[PDB]
Enzyme design. Sequence first.
Site, PDB file in Angstrom:
ATOM      1  N   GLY A  32       1.765  -4.805   0.456  1.00  0.00           N
ATOM      2  CA  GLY A  32       2.245  -4.187   1.253  1.00  0.00           C
ATOM      3  C   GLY A  32       3.726  -5.027   1.468  1.00  0.00           C
ATOM      4  O   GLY A  32       3.993  -5.803   0.439  1.00  0.00           O
ATOM      5  N   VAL A  37      -3.707  -7.846   0.519  1.00  0.00           N
ATOM      6  CA  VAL A  37      -4.888  -7.739   0.971  1.00  0.00           C
ATOM      7  C   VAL A  37      -5.895  -7.651  -0.110  1.00  0.00           C
ATOM      8  O   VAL A  37      -6.077  -6.954  -0.976  1.00  0.00           O
ATOM      9  CB  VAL A  37      -5.038  -6.546   1.927  1.00  0.00           C
ATOM     10  CG1 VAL A  37      -6.252  -6.483   2.749  1.00  0.00           C
ATOM     11  CG2 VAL A  37      -3.626  -6.695   2.908  1.00  0.00           C
ATOM     12  N   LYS A  55      -5.746 -11.148   3.899  1.00  0.00           N
ATOM     13  CA  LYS A  55      -4.122 -10.994   3.428  1.00  0.00           C
ATOM     14  C   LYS A  55      -3.585 -12.289   3.273  1.00  0.00           C
ATOM     15  O   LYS A  55      -3.243 -13.188   4.449  1.00  0.00           O
ATOM     16  CB  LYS A  55      -3.491 -10.162   4.845  1.00  0.00           C
ATOM     17  CG  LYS A  55      -2.090  -9.654   4.455  1.00  0.00           C
ATOM     18  CD  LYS A  55      -1.326  -8.965   5.342  1.00  0.00           C
ATOM     19  CE  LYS A  55      -1.659  -7.561   5.354  1.00  0.00           C
ATOM     20  NZ  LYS A  55      -0.511  -7.043   6.011  1.00  0.00           N
ATOM     21  N   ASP A 149       6.496  -3.628  13.203  1.00  0.00           N
ATOM     22  CA  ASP A 149       6.270  -2.835  12.089  1.00  0.00           C
ATOM     23  C   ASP A 149       5.116  -1.430  12.390  1.00  0.00           C
ATOM     24  O   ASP A 149       4.337  -1.544  11.721  1.00  0.00           O
ATOM     25  CB  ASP A 149       5.997  -3.726  10.831  1.00  0.00           C
ATOM     26  CG  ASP A 149       5.738  -2.791   9.503  1.00  0.00           C
ATOM     27  OD1 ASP A 149       6.205  -2.049   9.189  1.00  0.00           O
ATOM     28  OD2 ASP A 149       4.570  -3.331   8.777  1.00  0.00           O
ATOM     29  N   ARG A 153       0.650   3.896   9.027  1.00  0.00           N
ATOM     30  CA  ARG A 153      -0.438   3.197   7.891  1.00  0.00           C
ATOM     31  C   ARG A 153      -0.843   1.916   8.729  1.00  0.00           C
ATOM     32  O   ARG A 153      -1.827   1.400   8.236  1.00  0.00           O
ATOM     33  CB  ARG A 153       0.738   3.017   6.827  1.00  0.00           C
ATOM     34  CG  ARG A 153       1.742   1.995   7.239  1.00  0.00           C
ATOM     35  CD  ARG A 153       2.653   1.993   6.250  1.00  0.00           C
ATOM     36  NE  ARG A 153       3.784   0.983   6.288  1.00  0.00           N
ATOM     37  CZ  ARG A 153       5.030   1.142   6.854  1.00  0.00           C
ATOM     38  NH1 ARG A 153       5.222   2.362   7.245  1.00  0.00           N
ATOM     39  NH2 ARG A 153       5.754   0.061   7.092  1.00  0.00           N
ATOM     40  N   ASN A 154      -0.407   1.383   9.707  1.00  0.00           N
ATOM     41  CA  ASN A 154      -0.701   0.093  10.441  1.00  0.00           C
ATOM     42  C   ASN A 154      -1.746   0.476  11.514  1.00  0.00           C
ATOM     43  O   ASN A 154      -2.059  -0.406  12.525  1.00  0.00           O
ATOM     44  CB  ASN A 154       0.245  -0.642  10.711  1.00  0.00           C
ATOM     45  CG  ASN A 154       1.064  -1.449   9.396  1.00  0.00           C
ATOM     46  OD1 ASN A 154       0.236  -1.455   8.500  1.00  0.00           O
ATOM     47  ND2 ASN A 154       2.087  -1.863   9.258  1.00  0.00           N
ATOM     48  N   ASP A 167      -1.193  -5.642  12.019  1.00  0.00           N
ATOM     49  CA  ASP A 167      -0.073  -5.779  11.446  1.00  0.00           C
ATOM     50  C   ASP A 167       1.180  -6.196  11.956  1.00  0.00           C
ATOM     51  O   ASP A 167       2.251  -6.511  11.643  1.00  0.00           O
ATOM     52  CB  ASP A 167       0.307  -5.005  10.212  1.00  0.00           C
ATOM     53  CG  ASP A 167      -0.629  -5.077   8.987  1.00  0.00           C
ATOM     54  OD1 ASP A 167      -1.569  -6.036   8.972  1.00  0.00           O
ATOM     55  OD2 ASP A 167      -0.733  -4.221   8.043  1.00  0.00           O
TER      56      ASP A 167
HETATM   57  N1  LIG Z   1      -8.759  -5.113   7.876  1.00  0.00           N
HETATM   58  C1  LIG Z   1      -8.318  -4.178   6.545  1.00  0.00           C
HETATM   59  N2  LIG Z   1      -9.604  -3.452   6.322  1.00  0.00           N
HETATM   60  C2  LIG Z   1      -9.241  -2.685   5.138  1.00  0.00           C
HETATM   61  N3  LIG Z   1      -8.053  -2.392   4.766  1.00  0.00           N
HETATM   62  C3  LIG Z   1      -7.022  -2.879   5.006  1.00  0.00           C
HETATM   63  C4  LIG Z   1      -7.081  -3.954   6.164  1.00  0.00           C
HETATM   64  N4  LIG Z   1      -5.863  -4.439   6.327  1.00  0.00           N
HETATM   65  C5  LIG Z   1      -5.317  -3.756   5.378  1.00  0.00           C
HETATM   66  N5  LIG Z   1      -5.842  -2.749   4.493  1.00  0.00           N
HETATM   67  C6  LIG Z   1      -5.467  -1.920   3.737  1.00  0.00           C
HETATM   68  O1  LIG Z   1      -4.646  -2.850   2.582  1.00  0.00           O
HETATM   69  C7  LIG Z   1      -3.697  -2.262   2.019  1.00  0.00           C
HETATM   70  C8  LIG Z   1      -2.417  -3.314   1.952  1.00  0.00           C
HETATM   71  O2  LIG Z   1      -2.218  -3.451   3.397  1.00  0.00           O
HETATM   72  P1  LIG Z   1      -0.766  -3.693   3.922  1.00  0.00           P
HETATM   73  O3  LIG Z   1      -0.288  -5.087   3.128  1.00  0.00           O
HETATM   74  O4  LIG Z   1      -0.965  -4.187   5.141  1.00  0.00           O
HETATM   75  O5  LIG Z   1       0.088  -2.591   3.685  1.00  0.00           O
HETATM   76  P2  LIG Z   1       0.647  -1.248   4.410  1.00  0.00           P
HETATM   77  O6  LIG Z   1      -0.279  -1.178   5.458  1.00  0.00           O
HETATM   78  O7  LIG Z   1       0.725  -0.070   3.173  1.00  0.00           O
HETATM   79  N6  LIG Z   1       2.258  -1.741   4.615  1.00  0.00           N
HETATM   80  P3  LIG Z   1       2.625  -2.643   5.703  1.00  0.00           P
HETATM   81  O8  LIG Z   1       1.689  -3.432   6.596  1.00  0.00           O
HETATM   82  O9  LIG Z   1       4.062  -2.267   6.593  1.00  0.00           O
HETATM   83  O10 LIG Z   1       3.258  -3.879   5.114  1.00  0.00           O
HETATM   84  C9  LIG Z   1      -3.439  -0.932   2.807  1.00  0.00           C
HETATM   85  O11 LIG Z   1      -4.083   0.169   1.745  1.00  0.00           O
HETATM   86  C10 LIG Z   1      -4.151  -1.377   3.906  1.00  0.00           C
HETATM   87  O12 LIG Z   1      -4.929   0.010   4.501  1.00  0.00           O
HETATM   88 MG   LIG Z   2      -0.369  -2.582   6.762  1.00  0.00          MG
END
Ligand SMILES: Nc1ncnc2c1ncn2[C@@H]1O[C@H](COP(=O)(O)OP(=O)(O)NP(=O)(O)O)[C@@H](O)[C@H]1O
Ligand SMILES: [Mg+2]
Length: 298
Positions: A32, A37, A55, A149, A153-154, A167
Amino acid sequence: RDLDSALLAEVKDVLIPHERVVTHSDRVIGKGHFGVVYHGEYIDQAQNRIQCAIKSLSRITEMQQVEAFLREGLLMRGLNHPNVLALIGIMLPPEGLPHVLLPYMCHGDLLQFIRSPQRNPTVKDLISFGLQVARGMEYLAEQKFVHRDLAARNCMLDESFTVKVADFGLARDILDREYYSVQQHRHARLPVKWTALESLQTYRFTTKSDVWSFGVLLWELLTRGAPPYRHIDPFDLTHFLAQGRRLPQPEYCPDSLYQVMQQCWEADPAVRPTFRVLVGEVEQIVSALLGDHYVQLP
Ligand SMILES: Nc1ncnc2c1ncn2[C@@H]1O[C@H](COP(=O)(O)OP(=O)(O)NP(=O)(O)O)[C@@H](O)[C@H]1O
Ligand SMILES: [Mg+2]
């Protein structure tokens, strides 16, 4: 690149020693704005092994920022609400970057849920998810946390489809201006289009700029995941908003909810409602719905 003993003691209640954690660096969930993650595992206090998400933060490098983050981590560790994703803790590998341990959410994020061709969400389903987000945000606001943020998506989904706002505590005033900048035109990052007009201008965020973000989030829900301002170059976005143009009312969005969205996007932050008021308003709308429509994909 080691922490002062005093700090380590100060933030002890949120640190997890690297040797109580496995990061499956080959089991990447996704990347992200603020890091990568991974699937992972840690040992709890009862000595049981727990699966989780992990993460690794990419933007926290300077030691002053690392320290700031850990002290903020300690605050977040005490957050506890059904609609807010828990912070399990933070892990510092001996040489390397801060890793945040999160409960694994098996049903992914709201954005993907609502975009799934395999589902047929109704208006009332979608507003009900929105209410859960409002409740999580009310709690964060009360605890003096600004998300910065917030977007569909979050908002993560657990086994029982409870929404967990996630997030927060990552983006910061000023330091992360790259992700909110419009000078890249169509190379600008997603968050631009969720960000309050004043915060686009200053890179200072408040609960009222989160309220703006929440309005865009409601619009996502009721379009089932349309991209906001799809045909507008981000370079023109501040001018569009300054003229008082806004996202249009989705086809099956009730007038009462579109009105709430409009309140969320008032140009004067002081005029926008609090999350406490939004909770109440959205609850009232839900209870007063007449009939129900399926909502199509965009
Ligand atoms: N606790 C969690 N359990 C499962 N999947 C997760 C979790 N946290 C994040 N993800 C997933 O991991 C991926 C990357 O997450 P992330 O880096 O937060 O990107 P994002 O949500 O797409 N953008 P952003 O949070 O705005 O930076 C996404 O598909 C999330 O849905
Ligand atoms: Mg996210």
